[PDB]
Amino acid sequence: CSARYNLAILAFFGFFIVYALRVNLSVALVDMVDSKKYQWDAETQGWILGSFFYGYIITQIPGGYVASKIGGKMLLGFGILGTAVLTLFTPIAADLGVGPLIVLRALEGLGEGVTFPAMHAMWSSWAPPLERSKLLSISYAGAQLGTVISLPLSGIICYYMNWTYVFYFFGTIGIFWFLLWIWLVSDTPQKHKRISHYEKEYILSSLRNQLSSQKSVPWVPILKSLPLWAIVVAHFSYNWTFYTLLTLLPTYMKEILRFNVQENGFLSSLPYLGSWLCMILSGQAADNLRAKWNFSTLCVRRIFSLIGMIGPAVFLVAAGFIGCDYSLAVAFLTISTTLGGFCSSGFSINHLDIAPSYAGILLGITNTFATIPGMVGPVIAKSLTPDNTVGEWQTVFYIAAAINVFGAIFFTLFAKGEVQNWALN
Numbered sequence: 001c002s003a004r005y006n007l008a009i010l011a012f013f014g015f016f017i018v019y020a021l022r023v024n025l026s027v028a029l030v031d032m033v034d035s036k037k038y039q040w041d042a043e044t045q046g047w048i049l050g051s052f053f054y055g056y057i058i059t060q061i062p063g064g065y066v067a068s069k070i071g072g073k074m075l076l077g078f079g080i081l082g083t084a085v086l087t088l089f090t091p092i093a094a095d096l097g098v099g100p101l102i103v104l105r106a107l108e109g110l111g112e113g114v115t116f117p118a119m120h121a122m123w124s125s126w127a128p129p130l131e132r133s134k135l136l137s138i139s140y141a142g143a144q145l146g147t148v149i150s151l152p153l154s155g156i157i158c159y160y161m162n163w164t165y166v167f168y169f170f171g172t173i174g175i176f177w178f179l180l181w182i183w184l185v186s187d188t189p190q191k192h193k194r195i196s197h198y199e200k201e202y203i204l205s206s207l208r209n210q211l212s213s214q215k216s217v218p219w220v221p222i223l224k225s226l227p228l229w230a231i232v233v234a235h236f237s238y239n240w241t242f243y244t245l246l247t248l249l250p251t252y253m254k255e256i257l258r259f260n261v262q263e264n265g266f267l268s269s270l271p272y273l274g275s276w277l278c279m280i281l282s283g284q285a286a287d288n289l290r291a292k293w294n295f296s297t298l299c300v301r302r303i304f305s306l307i308g309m310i311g312p313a314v315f316l317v318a319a320g321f322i323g324c325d326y327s328l329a330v331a332f333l334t335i336s337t338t339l340g341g342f343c344s345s346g347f348s349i350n351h352l353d354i355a356p357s358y359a360g361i362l363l364g365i366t367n368t369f370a371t372i373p374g375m376v377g378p379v380i381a382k383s384l385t386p387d388n389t390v391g392e393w394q395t396v397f398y399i400a401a402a403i404n405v406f407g408a409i410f411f412t413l414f415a416k417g418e419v420q421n422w423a424l425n
């Protein structure tokens, strides 16, 4: 197809391999622990699952600066390559000990956390303003589809074969994809070796009216404004529940619901598939709402954020109420994750609604602060649930629901959407 849609497809596969390499461990740890198996304790498993988010936190904002400086192509390609090779060496790191695996996961976090800003730095030069929505949607849906596919796929490989083949498969697939990314993609349409003249003129002429402003991202602004911290804490509360689910759901099904590894992998993707299919309709629902009602822009934000952050909390509480039920617990979990889909138009769009031309930096700040739950939630949750502890699983579900409620309340108490009065260049 066209050059920019080729970039969109290759970005889709890139993010598919990013989230895969992120999530394959959450399924591999189900079989990698003893009742080749290792005698890892509950606290160790939490650290091993959470070590990735240390690197993801560390390399986020410097990754954005480097992407702005030297561009997206090489930076993202090398991030993916340095995640794939570390995944390939993870099985031998498991034999060397717990410490080697933790440092492997930390280095994977450092490699992988630069991917998102490197992609935004490419779409700052590739996506025309009229068409940015479709391109960003196609590019970023790769992450969600990556989780949705890599859960059952990891389960299938981990059941039919040993768990090491999961890591080998994803590592070799990452290397193979890098062999395409280094070749078909370029930093900027002027630097593209094969783009047609008319497409290049279209992209440049459409981006001219924005790049002619010459005032985008001139400094690190004074981010004292409370409306930024309200959306930051909303993102924190959302990511807390999302990552607590992502890093524990296969473990939860193995430990409480007692599903087989294959069935565990199949069922673990249902909540995220539901979340994807709800998020994709959420934009159309928001358009339908905007088409009729005289609501202010803040109104749709607050209603959608409340729905998408409260529904998951109440349904996670409900899943706590009838835990150990092989049929109803998974239904409540998938309903929770599906209701979580409204959060995009609830608060994720607010990042660029309250401050255009600063979205790439403000969203990076918010994502740096909101990946603290990736480091905190998994380890404390695994510490709180030592062996079976249906009561402690209820306890962690209550903790996640309370965090969601706090985030929704704080966001709705301080959400603004016009202008921060300093972002107006």
Ligand SMILES: CC(C)C[C@H](NC(=O)OCC1c2ccccc2-c2ccccc21)C(=O)O
Residues within 6 Å of the ligand: 136, 137, 140, 141, 143, 144, 279, 343, 344, 345, 348, 349
């Ligand atoms: C609102 C849409 C366009 C954004 C969405 N992006 C996405 O990557 O979701 C994955 C999940 C998430 C959901 C909502 C807000 C933040 C996050 C996030 C951050 C880090 C890792 C995973 C996630 C899309 O375009 O489909």
